[model samples]
Every structure is written in C-alpha cells, then in structure tokens.
Target: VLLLDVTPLSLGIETMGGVMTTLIAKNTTIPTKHSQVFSTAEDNQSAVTIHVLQGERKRAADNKSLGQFNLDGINPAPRGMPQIEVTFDIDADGILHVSAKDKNSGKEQKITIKASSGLNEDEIQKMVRDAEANAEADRKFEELVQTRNQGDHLLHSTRKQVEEAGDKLPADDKTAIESALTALETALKGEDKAAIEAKMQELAQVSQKLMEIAQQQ
Candidate 1:
C-alpha cells in the first residue's frame, strides 16, 4: 500500500476583539483537531457568532467561511462572564467538522464543513491505480540503468586496485581479474547511477565467487 500526503486548507476564527486568530495552517496533517476558548463581548449577550473559516489569511474576510453558528443564551451574565469553547476537526478525507460548547452551561452544538482544497480519496486512488499498472515496465527500466552504472564503477575501481597491487598476485589470477574488469567497463559506458548500482552488485557477487575459488586453490 502507498502512503499519500495531503495538505488541507487553513482553519481559524475571529476573536471577540475582531482579530483573526488562526488555529491550524495549510499543509498540516489530517485527522487533527484544535480548540480555543472565547468570552462574550458585552453584558447579557445571549448569543455569539462563532465564525469558522478555512484559508491562510490574517483577516476573516480574506478566508472562506466553513460554517458559522451561534452560542445561544449564554447565561445572561455581564460581558466577558460567559466563555465558549470551540473545536475544529479535520479527518483523513479532508473534511472539516466543528463543535462549540458553552463552558459555564455545558450547552453544545456540532456542524460539518464540506470545503476541501485538496484531492479527495477517489482521485488519489485513481493515480495509484495508474502507477501500479505500469509498475513492471518501470522496474525493468530502472534495473537496466542500475546495472550499467554498477558495471562502470566496478571496472574503474578494479583497475585502480590492480595497478596498486602490481606483481603481488599470481599472473593467471591477475589476468582473469583484469579480463572481468574490462568486460564490466564495456557494459557500463552509457548507463546511469541506478544501472551502475545493479552492475556493481553483480560484479561483487562474481568477485566473491572468484575469491572463494582462489582460497580453495
């Protein structure tokens, strides 16, 4: 299974003082929630508009309103006496849901917001399906490139090692090693890094086998 990264819209609300306070920013992970508390603006203010918005903006007017609800009949106390708690939740499917409660009276209301700025589940699944359909062809192309690169680097390093060793090893073994190195170099002339890595692995296996044979001798 493939894991996908999703970036949803920013979320925030307006403060009682008319300031736009941000709760969650754009590109944040999903299945996340945030909460904040606010007080009534005036004495005996029975209800307050909890304007929930989505966007990365410092002003409420600059963002899109997900939804707005009233915290009704807030205990008719002096201004700032009643506090309301608001919560925002974003699910994995990029859906936003909101809930608000009066802290003093335990009154609550919940709403679902359908504004999504990112691709939905069906779109992502379609892309994954397309990728899977061409998987084998892609793998083969990658492997070919890898083999070529590996062959080139192995040839280069083996030559360097042989020159350094000079006459330290037996003539026959040295000749065979040089022959294998030359073959790898020829195969790697036009290969990319991935191909080179594949070739390098093959060369390593061959070298190990030869080393074992020499030890037995």
Candidate 2:
C-alpha cells in the first residue's frame, strides 16, 4: 500500500502558560511518532489535564481544539517535578493517536482515533497546486529581501569610502560620488528591485574611483 505524506495541520498539546507545544508539526511525513515529557506546574499535583490541539499558533486558545483527556493517577509532586510522557502518532490513514503515561505510576491513557477530514483525490490535487504556488511566492519574497540587504551594505561601505577620500579627489569625482549616494539611498527606501540594482551598479563605479584616488593620497 502506498502511503501519502501530506499533513493538514500541526498537532500539539497545551502547556502551563496557555501555549500550544508542537509535537508533530504539519507537513510532516505520516506514519511518524514523536514524544515529549511534561511535568506538574503545581505543588503536590495529583493529576494533569492533557489538552489536545491542532494549528500553528503560539497561544493554545488561538489554535483549534481537538480533544482532551486527563491522566489522573499521578503521585503527589511539586511544580516542575513530575514526569508525564506524551506521545503523538499519525497512522497511514492520517488519524491521530495520542497517549500519556505517568512515569512514576506507570498508568497510561490512550485515545482511539477514527478517520475524519479525509480529502478526495481532486481536492488533494488542488491543495497541492495551491501549495506549490504559495511556495514559489515565498521563495521570491525571500530573494528580494536578501538582495535588498546586500545592496544596503554595498551602499553603506561606498558612502564611507567616498567621504574619507575628502578633498583629495578631483572636484568632478566628488560631485559624482555625492549625487550617486543620495540617489541610491532614496532608491533603497523604496521597494523597486530594478532601481536598487541600478543604484548598486552606480555605487560600484563610484567606489572604484574613490579607491583609486585614495591610494594616490
């Protein structure tokens, strides 16, 4: 049997600070298992509530509630001192299986899962197409950010070199460098990729001359 590898959403558990702690992240391969150990947040706590959640949020309340179960036979312990093992596993059919075991008492609680939210072949195909498009968009946005940052660094260094050259350079060379700096700075403040690239070319030409003149000094 061929197993599909796509995941719809992230699966996690609720932590003491109302945050969703990721156990099995979304888009993770199926037929996988992950486990984490948790401790009591209160002194002499006898039990712990294991709240199941799904989604990508820093806060548990902001995520979708899946289900919850209580592991009720913990030996009384202090805050941050009890050990509870929580395990999350997804089967080939994409059903979630959750288990919690008290390390001290060896008592375990498990939840049986029945399949829901199964997608049709066409729906899965469409989601895959949409995901591909989103991936391309994200890649392009990152490229632009990196390019812009590189341009900024080039411009900053060019400005410093030109200023330090001072009056040692020809009057015409100084004017060209000043004009190039102002134009490049202005272009960088905007999101026009072509403009920033052109400014980078201009800065390179100006810095080359600045370097040559400085060596003469």
Candidate 3:
C-alpha cells in the first residue's frame, strides 16, 4: 500500500478575522484539503490578498509566511456581497496548492508550490508518483496565467492604437482592430485558454494590417 506521506507543520491562509485560518494542521497526513469562505472588507472592492502561512499560531503576524496573492478581476459589488472560496490542498511528496474562486462568477486562480518546510523527498518513487499525478495540471494552470498576462498586454497596446489614430483611419480597419480588442478582452475574462490564444493571433494580424495602411503623405 502506498501510504500518503505527511506534512511537517500546520498550514493556513490569512483570515478576514485576523487569525491564521488553519487548513492542514501540524503532522497531518498528506493528500488532504481544507477551505474557507470570505467576503470583501470594503465596498466595491475588486480584490483581496491572502497570505499562506505555516505555523501553529492564532495570530497571522506570528506565523511564517509562505506566499501571498490577490483574488482579482472581481465583479463590482457592494462590500461583503462578494463570496470568495479559498481552497488549500496538500499532496504526497510535500506539494501545496492554494486557490481562490469567486462564487458568483465561478472564476478561479490557483497556485501550487513546494511546501516550505524544508522537508525534502528522497524517495524516487514518491517524487515520480506525485509528479505524475500533479505535474500536467500544474503546467496547464501556469500556461493559463502566462497567456492571460500576454493577452492583457496585447489588449492594452491594441486599444491604445485604436485611441491614438482611430478617428483618422479608414473605418473598416478601425472597426476590425477595435472588434479584435473586444474579443481578446472577453476571452481573457473567461477560462478558455485556446480561445485566448486565438484572439491573441487575431489581434496581431489586425495590428499588422493597421500598420500597413499608414500613408507616407
């Protein structure tokens, strides 16, 4: 039997109530999950950052900080109206993943990191097994984040072009580039990685066409 390995310390996220919201506790066996829900502390706030920590402490400042991330791209709403579900999972071979998802929009972001406990896995089998279980999904999510950032940058550049020379350009090219920007923006908002990539290509083509139409008069 392949017994799931254990983690060395208690792990948790920062709670809105100013405590270490314990997920996987000290000495807990691996391949486990814990989660909690939190709401915005301000009205119309678009994001909230949570710190992942490792330690047995009631107060957040007393704990060891693992990492921090923001739950962004939130839909505008009154304070406390946004429900964010935070999930923390631990796997064999000392892997930790934390995620935050907006309940209303069902949009999510997650990060997987090696547990910061200095607990190294010497067993080749455990490392390889865990890698097989989680590596592919890790790569996909990472690509999603990378692609979103690229798409966002392109959206900014293309939208800027439309604003700068749009009023003076031929109507057809202006509309084409504008529509491409809108499509990329929309795709970036959703979870379709392939669609986002496709829009990136479309935006590049539209940009090239706009540049070619520039006259030397």
Candidate 4:
C-alpha cells in the first residue's frame, strides 16, 4: 500500500497587498488538486507570470517561492476581462504540477515541483520564527553597528593624538596608550558590542591621560 503524505505548508500565489492567496492549506492530504482564476491587474497587459510559494505567512513576500511560470501570448484587454485558470496538481509521490491556461488565447504553461524543491518542516518553522523575530533582530544589528562605528572614530582620533603627544609623554604612559590602541583596533573587527565598547573606553581614557601629561609640559 502507498503511504499518504500531507502538505508541509500552505501553497499559494502572490496577490495584491503582498498577500499569500492560499489555494491549498497545510496538512491537506496529498494527491489532491486545486484551481483558481486570476485576472490581469492592469489594462492592455498581455502576459502574467505566476509565482508559486509555500509558507504560512500572511504576506507572499515573506514565504518561500518555489518557482514561476509565465503564460504569455494573452489577448490584450481591459483589466479583469481575461480569465487565467491556474491549476495545482500534487501527485501521490508529492510532486507538484502547476499549469496556467489563458481562456481567451488557449496559451498554457506548466511547471513541476519535486518534493526536494519544497521546504522541510524545520526550514518552515525557522522561516516563521525569523519573521516573528525580525524586528528585534534588526534592532540588535543596528546597535552593534553603531557601537562599532563609535569604536572606529575613537581609534582614529586617539592614534593621531598619540602621534602628536608621543615624544612629550613618559615612556610608561606611551606604552600603555599604544597597546590599548592596538587592542581596540582588533576589537572593531569583531561583532561583540560590549567587548568593543570596553576597548573603546580603555583607549579613550588612556589617551586622556596622555592629554594631561602634555598639558603639564
């Protein structure tokens, strides 16, 4: 007996407002098929390319796009005048066969999506989690970048200050500032926010001591 399988995620096409218009819901038994009619959004548009995707996201752009097929040679007419019948067929073995036919011109295009071409459960879950966590993740990255830039500016100004005051400073103060400058230079190349800031402060304070020594002389 053949073992039946279910869809890992919803399958659909991209529509207006970046929405995912689902044709087949997730966990639906395989070897099933579905069809939907779509129209050109713009007048005099003669062709439409269908984008196939899989995911549970509300926006089509957030989902994983599997493939695309274009049904051109369409008859030109006003928007919503032409009818394009798109069919999604999934065989027992989990291969997806998609076809788009223009009712006016009889032009058709098809694409086959194998099981391997689709996302696994793990990847689908990760994509869902990633979208949910995207805002916080973006903020965290921006914070790190800002810290890195702060470290960068400090490194530059401190180096110039050290060069100008090197001869005037005591040897111990010069060595301390030089080593701190090198350590901060290495920290800027990394992604650690706290570590980089520590290096920046160390260099900044050490350079300030050099300023004090120069002021005395």
Best by lDDT: 4
Tens-place lDDT per residue, model 4, 65-114, is 99987888877786667899988898988798889999888889998998
Model 2, poorest ten-residue lDDT window? 112-121
Listing every candidate in turn, what is its Cα RMSD in Å to the true structure after a full C-alpha superposition?
23.4, 15.2, 13.4, 18.0
Stretches of model 4 off by over 4 angstroms after superposition: 1-3, 128-217
* Deviation from native of the Cα of residue 83 in model 4, angstroms: 0.5
* Deviating ranges (above 4 Å) for candidate 3: 1-4, 116-217
Off by over 4 Å in 1: 1-5, 115-217
Better of 1 and 3 by TM-score: 3
The per-model lDDT (C-alpha) reads 0.63, 0.74, 0.73, 0.79
State the lDDT of candidate 3 residue by residue for 80-164, as single tens digits: 6799998988876668889999999888888778755432345333434544575566566557767886787787656655666
Per-residue alpha-carbon lDDT of model 1 for 123-173, expressed as tens digits? 445534544665675556545644553454456556656665556656766
Q: Which runs of model 2 end up more than 4 angstroms from their true locations?
A: 1-3, 117-217
Alpha carbon lDDT at 125, candidate 1: 53
Q: Rank the candidates by lDDT, best first.
A: 4, 2, 3, 1
Ordered from best to worst TM-score, the candidate numbers read 4, 2, 3, 1
**Quality of model 3 by C-alpha lDDT:** 0.73
For candidate 1, what is the total of clashing residue pairs?
Answer: 12
